[PDB]
A = this chain, B = another copy of it.
Amino acid sequence: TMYICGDSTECSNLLLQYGSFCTQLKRALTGIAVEQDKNTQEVFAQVKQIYKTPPIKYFGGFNFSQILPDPSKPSKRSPIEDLLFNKVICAQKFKGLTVLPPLLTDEMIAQYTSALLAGTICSGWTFGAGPALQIPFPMQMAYRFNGIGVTQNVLYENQKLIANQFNSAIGKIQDSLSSTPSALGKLQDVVNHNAQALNTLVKQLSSKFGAISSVLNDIFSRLDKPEAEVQIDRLITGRLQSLQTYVTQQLIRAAEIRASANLAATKMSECVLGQSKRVDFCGKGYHLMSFPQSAPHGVVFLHVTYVPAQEKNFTTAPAI
């Protein structure tokens, strides 16, 4: 009502003749708003036990200081998370277009992420299926190597090389993201598209839709009733139609986001809480393990994979 008629009594009364469209519009937008909290629920709240990060960030040569929370920061985010957040209203409010807060705040999401990381490092994937069963990190890796068809002795005899390759690979992540503004464009785009939708809806109020004036009070003061009703009817139809268009587009976009949230939830379960055997599902190469990070309106996964190198030609035979 506010969007269409503002504070104009004559319009507010006339608007009642066009049925229950305003009710339907609220019905659709309310459904979307609720779903947006559910989508977050499904991705992050996969653990009923909230674990505390370990006192140390260095395990058997493996440095996790870039993925674990940095205590020197007021927000207690990790070095990588802080970068992700750093790269990624009255005009609308005054037209009856408002914004509702999320149920889970950034701090709450951070706690879920920390619990998942603490579990992954100290208990591997046992906390996902059942109780958190402690294991030495180097031994967790040994099992992850067996899982890709590589005998565990390969890890133990090359622990220093592997730890070094890992540590370097992680450091490069912060540099890659920092130097690549487009890296988080995928989350940027969602924000931009929704902002445009609201701005378009507001500008449409300036359209006359064939009416003598875009302003309802600038009609009743000049025109006789039967004449004003024609001009007002045009304005109501145009503005109501604009709301219908807005909602339709939001329902379609919501469907796309829901699908993305479902994929993220699947990856959390299969990449973070276990080891995947699905090709290119948890990154290119042979999946070993993954670590979640928080981000604006989404989630970021760090995928650690094993890649073969320096092949040699040998003669072979099917049998001896």
Interface check A181, CB cutoff 8 A? no
A252 at the interface (CB under 8 A from B): yes
A residues 110-138 near B (Cβ < 8 Å) are 125-126, 128-131, 133-134, 136, 138
Query: For window 196-212 of chain A, which residues contact chain B by CB distance below 8 Å?
Result: 200, 203-204, 206-210
List the B side residues contacting A125 at CB < 8 Å: 279
Q: Is A20 an interface residue (CB 8 A)?
A: yes
Q: Which residue of B lies closest to A319 (CB)?
A: B156
B133 and A311 contact, CB distance less than 8 A: yes
Contact B244 A207 (CB under 8 A): no
Q: For the complex formed by this chain, how many copies does it contain in all?
A: 3
Interface residues as binary, A245-256 with B (CB distance below 8 Å gives 1, 0 otherwise): 100100110011
- Residues on the B chain within 8 Å of A58, using CB: none
Partner of A279, one of B21, B209, B269: B269
Does A83 sit within 8 A of B, measured CB to CB?
no
The answer to whether A285 has its CB under 8 Å from any CB of chain B is: yes
Shortest C-beta distance, A209 to chain B (Å), equals 6
The reply to whether the CB of A24 lies closer than 8 angstroms to some CB of chain B is yes
- A278 CB to closest chain B CB (Å) equals 6
- Residue numbers of A with Cβ under 8 A of B are 17-21, 24, 46, 125-126, 128-131, 133-134, 136, 138-139, 142, 156, 200, 203-204, 206-210, 229, 233, 238, 242, 244-245, 248, 251-252, 255-256, 259, 269-270, 273-274, 277-281, 284-286, 307-309, 311, 313, 316, 318-319
Apart from A128-B279, A136-B318, A270-B279, 10 more pairs, CB < 8 Å: A17-B210, A19-B204, A20-B200, A126-B308, A138-B318, A142-B318, A252-B255, A259-B259, A270-B280, A274-B279
